[PDB]
Design a protein around this ligand. Structure first.
Ligand SMILES: CC(=O)N[C@@H]1[C@@H](O)[C@H](O[C@@H]2O[C@H](CO)[C@@H](O[C@@H]3O[C@H](CO)[C@@H](O)[C@H](O)[C@H]3NC(C)=O)[C@H](O)[C@H]2NC(C)=O)[C@@H](CO)O[C@H]1O
Length: 129
């Protein structure tokens, strides 16, 4: 599923990401935009053999199990395919663990390089939120 910007903003807010760990909703929408282009089915292979999955490109080395990532933990205790569903619940629960693990949203390279420090409220502009 390719979410619309406001559709994803409302889903993320409903799933409790708005201001989670102090990150405003615009940060999460921005991160999803640059990580996956709002595509729940986005998958991207890393050079170390892990894969990034879903709307928030959650990595299989630490957070989910894909059965092909040597040295992996499954700290979200979930199949990585469950991070590709049209329902982002699993991605949000896992993202909540990720952003609470110590380095905040710097866990998302696209967020750090493209969202951090920018006017992230633009990502929720016009949404009935
Ligand atoms: C969205 C996503 O999956 N991003 C991936 C990153 O999570 C990953 O970076 C590594 O993440 C782990 C888990 O947060 C980091 O571990 C934590 O590190 C801090 C110290 O920096 C420590 O306080 C935490 O206890 C520790 N947590 C655990 C569970 O051990 C780790 O430092 C990150 N490593 C690097 C090199 O950034 C990167 C790289 O694998 O991939 C992203 O896709």
């Amino acid at each position: 599923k390719v979410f619309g910007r406001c559709e994803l903003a409302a889903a993320m807010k409903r799933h409790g990401l708005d201001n989670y760990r102090g990150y405003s909703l615009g940060n999460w929408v921005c991160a999803a935009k640059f990580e996956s282009n709002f595509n729940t089915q986005a998958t991207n292979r890393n050079t170390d053999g892990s894969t990034d999955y879903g709307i928030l490109q959650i990595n299989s080395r630490w957070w989910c199990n894909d059965g092909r990532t040597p040295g992996s933990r499954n700290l979200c205790n979930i199949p990585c395919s469950a991070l590709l569903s049209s329902d982002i619940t699993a991605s949000v629960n896992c993202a909540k663990k990720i952003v609470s693990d110590g380095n905040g949203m710097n866990a998302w390279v696209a967020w750090r390089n493209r969202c951090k420090g920018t006017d992230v409220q633009a990502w929720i502009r016009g949404c009935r939120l």
